[PDB]
Amino acid sequence: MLTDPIADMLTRIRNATRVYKESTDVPASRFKEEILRILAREGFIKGYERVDVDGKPYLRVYLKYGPRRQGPDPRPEQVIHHIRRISKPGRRVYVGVKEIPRVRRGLGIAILSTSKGVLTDREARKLGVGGELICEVW
């Protein structure tokens, strides 16, 4: 039944990016869209569309990756080095404003739901609000 839709996707993304798969699906949701709509905005994904699989709504997340590499191991750098859910279902995280993280000194992003949207560390910050720290990526 899945306990958490969200970190499930992020996992999808994660496991995917690790073998470099071009794109990989994930059941559709108003919310995951919104999550991704930021994965795009900030350039972690190339993008996503409400692709179908057997009558069932999904999303193609088209994964961004580094350039090839020189020397031992032609391992492309990684557009998404590290993704991990924060506010888990078993333990809700609810940061006020002056409490939002500073992910890896700026380079990092921190999504999070809010009464005025689905903003980010700076977007919600500058906007001047607080909400459920969805997760951080960098």
Q: 133 touches which of another protein, RNA, none (CB within 5 to 8 A by kind)?
A: none
CA nearest to 74, candidates 14, 22, 20, 21 = 20
Between the alpha carbon of residue 123 and those of residues 36, 69, 88, 111, 135, the distances in Å are 15, 34, 22, 9, 14
- Site residues (CB under 8 A) for another protein? 42-44, 64, 66, 77, 79, 90-94, 104-108
Q: What are the two backbone dihedrals, phi and then psi, of residue 47, each rounded to the nearest 5 degrees?
A: 160, -170
The piece of 37-45, 64-72, 91-99, 101-109 that touches RNA (CB under 7 A) is 91-99
Q: 104 touches which of RNA, another protein, none (CB within 5 to 8 A by kind)?
A: another protein
- Interacting positions 2-31 with RNA (CB under 7 A): 2-5, 8, 11-12, 15-16, 18-19, 21, 24, 27-31
DSSP characters over 17-40 = HHHT-SEE-----HHHHHHHHHHH
What does the binding site for RNA look like in residue numbers (CB under 7 A)? 1-5, 8, 11-12, 15-16, 18-19, 21, 24, 27-32, 57, 89-90, 92, 94-99, 114-115, 128-132
